[PDB]
Amino acid sequence: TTALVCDNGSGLVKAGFAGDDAPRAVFPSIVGRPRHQGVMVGMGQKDSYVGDEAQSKRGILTLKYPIEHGIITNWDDMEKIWHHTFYNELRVAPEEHPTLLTEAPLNPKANREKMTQIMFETFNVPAMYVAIQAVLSLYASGRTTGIVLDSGDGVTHNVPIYEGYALPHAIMRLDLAGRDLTDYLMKILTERGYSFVTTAEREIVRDIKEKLCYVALDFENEMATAASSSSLEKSYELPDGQVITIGNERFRCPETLFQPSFIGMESAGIHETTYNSIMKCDIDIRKDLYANNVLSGGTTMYPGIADRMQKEITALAPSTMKIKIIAPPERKYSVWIGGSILASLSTFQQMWISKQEYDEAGPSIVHRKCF
Amino acid sequence: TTALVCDNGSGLVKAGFAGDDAPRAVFPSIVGRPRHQGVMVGMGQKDSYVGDEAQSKRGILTLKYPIEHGIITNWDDMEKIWHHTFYNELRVAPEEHPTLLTEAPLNPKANREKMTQIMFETFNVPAMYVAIQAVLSLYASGRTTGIVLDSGDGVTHNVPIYEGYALPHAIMRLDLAGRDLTDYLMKILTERGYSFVTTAEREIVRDIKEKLCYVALDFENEMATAASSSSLEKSYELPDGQVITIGNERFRCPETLFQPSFIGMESAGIHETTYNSIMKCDIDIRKDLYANNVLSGGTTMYPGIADRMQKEITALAPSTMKIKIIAPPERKYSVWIGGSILASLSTFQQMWISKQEYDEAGPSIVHRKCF
Amino acid sequence: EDADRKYEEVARKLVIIESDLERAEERAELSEGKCAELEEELKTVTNNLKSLEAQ
Amino acid sequence: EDADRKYEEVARKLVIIESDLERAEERAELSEGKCAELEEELKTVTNNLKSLEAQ
Ligand SMILES: Nc1ncnc2c1ncn2[C@@H]1O[C@H](COP(=O)(O)OP(=O)(O)O)[C@@H](O)[C@H]1O
Ligand SMILES: Nc1ncnc2c1ncn2[C@@H]1O[C@H](COP(=O)(O)OP(=O)(O)O)[C@@H](O)[C@H]1O
Numbered sequence: 001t002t003a004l005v006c007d008n009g010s011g012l013v014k015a016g017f018a019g020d021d022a023p024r025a026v027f028p029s030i031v032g033r034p035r036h037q038g039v040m041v042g043m044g045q046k047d048s049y050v051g052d053e054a055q056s057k058r059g060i061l062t063l064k065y066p067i068e069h070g071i072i073t074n075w076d077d078m079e080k081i082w083h084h085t086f087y088n089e090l091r092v093a094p095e096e097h098p099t100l101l102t103e104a105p106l107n108p109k110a111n112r113e114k115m116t117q118i119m120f121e122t123f124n125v126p127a128m129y130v131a132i133q134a135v136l137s138l139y140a141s142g143r144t145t146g147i148v149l150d151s152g153d154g155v156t157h158n159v160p161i162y163e164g165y166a167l168p169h170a171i172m173r174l175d176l177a178g179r180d181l182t183d184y185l186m187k188i189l190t191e192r193g194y195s196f197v198t199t200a201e202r203e204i205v206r207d208i209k210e211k212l213c214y215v216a217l218d219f220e221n222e223m224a225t226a227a228s229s230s231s232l233e234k235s236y237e238l239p240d241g242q243v244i245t246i247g248n249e250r251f252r253c254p255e256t257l258f259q260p261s262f263i264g265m266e267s268a269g270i271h272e273t274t275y276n277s278i279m280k281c282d283i284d285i286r287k288d289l290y291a292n293n294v295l296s297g298g299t300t301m302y303p304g305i306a307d308r309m310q311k312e313i314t315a316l317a318p319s320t321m322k323i324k325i326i327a328p329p330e331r332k333y334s335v336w337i338g339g340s341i342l343a344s345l346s347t348f349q350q351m352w353i354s355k356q357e358y359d360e361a362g363p364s365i366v367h368r369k370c371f
Numbered sequence: 372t373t374a375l376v377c378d379n380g381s382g383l384v385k386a387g388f389a390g391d392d393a394p395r396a397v398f399p400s401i402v403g404r405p406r407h408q409g410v411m412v413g414m415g416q417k418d419s420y421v422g423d424e425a426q427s428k429r430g431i432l433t434l435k436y437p438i439e440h441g442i443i444t445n446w447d448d449m450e451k452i453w454h455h456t457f458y459n460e461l462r463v464a465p466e467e468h469p470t471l472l473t474e475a476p477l478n479p480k481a482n483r484e485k486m487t488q489i490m491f492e493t494f495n496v497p498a499m500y501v502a503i504q505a506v507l508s509l510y511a512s513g514r515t516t517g518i519v520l521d522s523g524d525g526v527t528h529n530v531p532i533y534e535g536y537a538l539p540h541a542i543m544r545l546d547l548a549g550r551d552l553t554d555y556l557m558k559i560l561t562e563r564g565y566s567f568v569t570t571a572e573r574e575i576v577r578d579i580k581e582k583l584c585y586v587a588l589d590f591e592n593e594m595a596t597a598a599s600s601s602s603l604e605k606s607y608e609l610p611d612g613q614v615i616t617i618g619n620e621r622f623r624c625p626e627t628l629f630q631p632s633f634i635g636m637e638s639a640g641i642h643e644t645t646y647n648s649i650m651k652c653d654i655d656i657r658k659d660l661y662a663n664n665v666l667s668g669g670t671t672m673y674p675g676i677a678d679r680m681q682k683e684i685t686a687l688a689p690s691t692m693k694i695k696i697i698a699p700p701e702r703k704y705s706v707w708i709g710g711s712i713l714a715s716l717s718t719f720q721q722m723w724i725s726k727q728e729y730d731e732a733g734p735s736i737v738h739r740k741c742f
Numbered sequence: 743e744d745a746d747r748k749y750e751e752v753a754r755k756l757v758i759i760e761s762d763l764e765r766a767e768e769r770a771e772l773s774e775g776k777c778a779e780l781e782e783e784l785k786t787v788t789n790n791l792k793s794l795e796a797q
Numbered sequence: 798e799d800a801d802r803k804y805e806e807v808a809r810k811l812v813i814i815e816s817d818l819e820r821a822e823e824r825a826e827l828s829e830g831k832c833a834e835l836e837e838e839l840k841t842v843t844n845n846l847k848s849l850e851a852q
Contacts, residue, residue, distance in 0.1 A: 025692030071564075107566040175568075266406070266433060266569045588757060674751070678758050745800035752807045759814045766821045768802040780835040787842050794849060 003098040005134075006085060008189050009177065010067040010154030013051070013299065014336050018100065018217040018343035025089035027052040031077045032061030046286055050084045058200035069154040069175050070104040079118060086123065089105050093114045098127040098352055100343045102335055104119040104155045105132055106173045127352035128367065129343075134159035135166070136338030137296040141326060144284075146292030148336070149274055151257070151299035156270060158277040170280040173271045176260050178299045182206050184263050185213070185253040194244050205286040208236050209253060210247070214306040216251040217311065219258075223248060254302045258312070271312035278317075290317055295327045296334035304325050374469040374711040377456060380504070381438035382524030382549065383669070384422075385707050386456050389471070389714035394707045396460035398423040398480055402448045402531040403432030420447075421455045429571035440525040440546045442482050457494065468725055469498040473706060475526045476503055477544045484734040491729050498687060500714075501737060504508040505530035507709030512697060517663025521706065522628070522670035524549040527633070527641065529648040533656045539650035543644050547631050553577050555634050556584070556624040565615050579607050579617070580624060582711045586675040587622040588682065590629075604671045614684070625673045629683065640682035649688075659679070661688055663673035665697045667705035 003018040008029065016023035032054035038045065041315055054061055066077035086094045099119060103112060119128045134148040138161055141148075147160040160167050186196050186205050194203050212234055216222035226232050226248035234250065235243045256262045256327040258269035267273070278289050293313070295306065306327040314323045328334065342348055353370045361368075374389035378573055379400065387395040403425035409416050437448035457465050469492060474483060483501055484727055490499045505519040509532055512519075518531040528544040530537060556565050557576050567576050581603050587593035597603050597619040604618040627633040629640040639647070649660050663685070666677065677698040685694045699705065713719060732739070 080566065104559050106558070109562050110564070175566075258737075261406070264407075567795075588761075675754055678754070682761075743806075749800045749804050749807075752804055752811070756807050756814075759811060759818070761851060763814050763818050763821075766818050766825075770821050770825055770828070773825055773832070776831055777828050777835075780832060780839070783839060784835055787839060787846070791842055791846050794846060 001096070001370065002345040003100055004090070004092070004094070005100045005335045005336060005343055006082075007102050007317075007339060008067065008081075008214060009133075009335075010104075010177070010265065011065060012071060012153065013081060013085055013352045014092060014333065016336065016340065020340055020341050021337075022330075022333060025085060027089065028055060028069060029081050030054050030063045030065060031080055032057065032063050032075075034060055038059060041264060043248065043323055050080050051089070053355060055203070058203060060154065061200070063203070069177075070107050070125050070152075072115070075118070076112065079122060082118070083124065093224070094123045094125050097125065098129075098343075099123075099125045100128045100135045100339050102138075103130055103155050104150075104173065105134065105151070105159060105171050109367060112366050116353070116358070116366050117363045121354060125355075127354050129352050131339060131342065131371070132159065132166075133157075133335045134296075135161070136336075136342060137334045139338035139341045140295050140334045140336075141296075141328070141338075143287050143294065143326075146294045146326070147281075147289045148294040148296060149270060149300065151177060151270065151295075151297045153298060156257075156297075156299070156350040158274055160277055160281050160289055162281075162286075163308045164189060167281055170277045172277050174260075174267055174270070174273060175266070176257065176263070176265060178206075178209075180263055181253055181256055181299070182209060182211075184256050185209050185249065188249050188252060189244075189246075192245070192247075204238065208244075210301075211252050212236060213253045214248055214251055215254050215302045215308045216303060217308055219251070219255055222251055253303070257305075258301070258308070271309050271316070273294060274309070275313055287321060290321050291324045293323065293325045296331050298332045300327065300331050309365060333334060343349070372467065374468070374471060374714040375465070376471050376707060376714055377453075377463070378504075378707040378710060379438065379452075380473075380523045380525070380706070381436060381441060383706065384452060384456055386461060387707065387711065389411055389513070389711050391711055392708075393701075394711075396456060396493060398437060398460065399426060400452055401425050401434045401436055402451055403428060403434045404444075404489065407431055409644065411418055415471040417452065418544070421451050422460070423514070426574065429574060429645075431573070432481070432571045434574070436550075439546075441478050443486070446485065446489070453489070453494065457548045463616075465494045465496050468496060468497045469500075469714075470494075471710050472499065472501045473480060473500060473504045473507060473710060475523070475544065476505065476528050476530060476542050477522075478490050480738060483737055485731070487724070487737045488734045492727060496726070498725050500723050501742075502710060502713065503530065504528075504706045505667075506532070507572075507711065507713060508665060509703040510712050511705045512665050512667075512699070513708035514663055514665065514697075516659045517646065517665050517697070518648060518660045519665040519667060520641065521667045522548060522641070527628075527644075527668075529645055531652050531656075531660055533652075534660065538652055541648050543648045545631075545644060547634070547636060547638070549661075551634055552624055552627055553580055555627050556580050556620065559620050559623060560615075560617065563615075563617065573699075574677065575610065583617060584621050584624045584673060585605060586625045586679045587673060588674045588679055590622070590626055593622055625676070628670070628676075629679070632682055640681055640683070642687065645680070646684055646687045647695060658692060661692045662695050663697065664695060667701045667702050671698065671702050 003019050004015060006015040011029055012026065013029040014023040014026040016025060028051065032049045033047065047055060049061060054063060064077060066074040066081060072078050072084050077315060085094060101115060115127055115130065119125050134150045137148045137150055138146060144164050145156055145270060149158055150156065154177050156177050158168050158172045175193050181200060181203055187200065188194065196202065232250060233247050233307060235245050237243045258271060259266050260269060274293065278286055306325045310323055310325045317323060335339065353365055357365055357370065373595055375386060376389050377386040380554070382400060383397060384400040385394040385397040392728055399422065404418065420432060425434060426718060427433055435445065435448065437443055437445040437452060444450050448560045457463060472486060486501065487499060490496050492549045505528065508519045508521055509517060515535050516533045518529055525548050526544060526546060527548050531541050538739065540618045551572060553576055557618065558575065560567065569571065601618065603621060604616050605621065606614045606616045609613050629642060631638045631640060645664065677696045682696055686692060726737055728741065729736055
């Protein structure tokens, strides 16, 4: 028997089998519904497209995300997403496969409980288990000690771990992520006359961000050089034309991660919440944590983010300490890699939540020692 | 003449005149600054709101406390708070008024030294004195022996006193207090779906705590009760509607006082620290100390805390001793009341630190026998 | 809220006072038993003393 | 109004339990006083008997 590893996240579902090097099914977690009339009789069109199919018909659908900030807010849409993942992208019968799911730290309890209730009643899996994303990042990184910064698409968090013991009082969670960066980039593109208002134009803006944005090493000097020269201007070709020219908002967008006041948040940047989690930990492990600062998730994929975060954390920490930032090239999939590793471990086979345990104890079995 | 009794603490400045029955001015010790830009010209916006004014503009300010755990970290902010207390809340000129200040046991020495230096150079008071927050509680309680547990908002401490002699080697200090209980409640409210992140929603959470939290007599039985029934759930009304309902969380928050492992601290509970401070003292005074447990400060104000503490410390002490817990209804102001009594005493008029004495000896005169 | 706070406070008091009563009764019965042991020990020692008191 | 009812009933129960505990405490005082006197008397009579048997 094999276990499935479904890493949902907020905006990119990626699933596969336990024991592979990568997910075999990566698609956006969107559910589209047609918003126009529909004239051709006999077209036999459907009522809701999910996944990558909804990306080809953006000009006709209104796109919803069923997961806002880690939290699932539309259970019907999420059930559709899971059905698509099981039957159309993977082509497996979920009644004969254990399933490992992930979630972010410090979410509501009903999210997790309703998740397992769905997975047992509707999809009828034999076993299941929910894992923290940062722990799986640390498995895939090849470490057992380090502070992991997992910037996804809805939520960012730090989780310090030492020798396999997680320090729950030092976990930080921040609701600034790729979706907020996309909204900020849409808002500041209007300074040059481009306007993207539709949910289908949000995707165009996301592709722009992924392809052109980067983190500046020195924000003020980059602003000065963009004001003076014109060597930063880069062009992008929309699905039609009118190539858009992007100047300093190439790096003003991801700078929101280090200055969350740009989008009117009160909190501090990711470098500063990382340092604060460190100083929140004990004193005997701070050196190892400084030396094992692990990045993962898609929002950590900008060019220059590792160097920027090292500069900031080095300016913060004492001078006698060597700061190191681990940023693999397969960061975007680290949670899935770690999930596959963990589910393939033979020690883990006693940690699943079997269906009989659930039937006898209710969905409360999930927060129990069966974590 | 008249003397001023200013009880700073951390989280509530409360001042007044010596010889009064209660503080005249009680307001939070916060200093807010506007974090948005301001469009209406002619508003004549000021740049920093101190005190109770800052609580009305929470929505647009960022609030900072200038006192973290007893110690002062922002001397400019503390100077603003003192100026506000003297001129706007009390409306008196500090040139003709001796001032009695208080601090907690076992603080840095420069804290008290610089407090003195400010009170003489900046405000030009004629005299001053710094008292310990637990001795004043014992004054106001009408005792002359007893062990006092003064749990404020930044620091908790025990000070055993017998016949007016304090035993410094048995003084305990614990940095767990109301601010950490507020942070723990902010954290555990998340598991129900409510998120308070701003420094201005910290105040909403503090009001929730004050109004709804209580100490369970038996933690495990109350946990089972909350699991089974739903008679514990009370609802709170946020500043904009959206009533929230909290159940289990009502007694999990102040239980952190008796199990500091909830917030990752290694220390022992309040009851165990009190008992250890007892057993630290001589053997001849332990009976009176058992009979005179005096609680003071705002964090000792939860419903059921006296009963719980008596039960725990009774399980600890030998079975032949009479344990009593002195919990007046005006606990929160005991330090100020005792300070007023002490400053109005006649034998005390020789204990002030005069201004000429200071000009003679420097700020070192404070720790000196002119204490 | 008035009535609710009043009754919850008095219910707290009820639980704590009945708690007091239980172990009060328990330790009372224990003191009674120990007093019975003192009684029987006293009778026996006085019997030994009177029997020895003949000479 | 139901809270008024149950507050009255718990005030009555409160007074009754107070009376029970008060008399139990008086009983504990009398039993411990008898215990003290009886232990002292045992010690004294065992002193007398050990002296007499030492003879
Ligand atoms: N090369 C890249 N540069 C910048 N941002 C990226 C890049 N690739 C992906 N992203 C951002 O990462 C987000 C997806 O992150 P992901 O790892 O899928 O998190 P989740 O799985 O929780 O949705 C997208 O919103 C996208 O904007
Ligand atoms: N009724 C109450 N129940 C629980 N906590 C309270 C209550 N009233 C005040 N507090 C807490 O007490 C703290 C204030 O304590 P205080 O005596 O003012 O210390 P300080 O003067 O050092 O600030 C606040 O953080 C508040 O959360």
